[PDB]
């Protein structure tokens, strides 16, 4: 009519994320939430700390422009919800890749069936 092709495979996406979420308990949370779109963006674009009391979103400071405190309070009575009780939510701006946020991980589980065909010769050992 107008043009779609934007669906693609939804499936594949989501059986994708169906392992992702089988693998961190982050992807799963927010899956439980069901957060809707600009704040699960924001949720996506972080990988999520947590301390003694709190939850701190360290979301790619490349996506900086999403993380917004009209985000971040729905997100924070959303895991308060979920916590039960008051979450101390907060969202930090750290690009440093050392964590995989529930977005990089849906397409790091993709690779990994790519990167295990490569990484079985790592596991063939030279000095590990």
């Known amino acids: 009519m107008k043009a779609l092709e934007h669906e693609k495979t939804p499936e594949l996406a989501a059986k994708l994320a169906a392992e ?3 693998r961190d308990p982050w992807a799963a949370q927010v899956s439980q939430l069901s957060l809707p779109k600009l704040v699960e963006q924001v949720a996506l674009n972080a990988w999520k700390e947590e301390s003694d009391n709190a939850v ?3 979301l790619r400071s ?3 422009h999403l993380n917004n ?10 895991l308060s919800m979920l916590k039960g009780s008051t ?3 907060t969202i930090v701006e750290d690009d440093n890749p050392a964590v995989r946020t529930p977005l990089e991980w849906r397409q790091a589980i993709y690779e990994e069936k ?3 065909a490569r990484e079985s010769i790592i596991a063939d050992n030279n000095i590990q």
């Open 62 to 64: 490349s996506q900086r």
């Open 56 to 58: 701190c979103l360290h």
């Open 20 to 22: 992702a979420i089988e």
């Open 87 to 89: 979450v101390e939510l």
């Open 69 to 78: 405190r009209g985000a971040q309070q729905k997100l924070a009575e959303a």
């Open 114 to 116: 790519l990167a295990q």
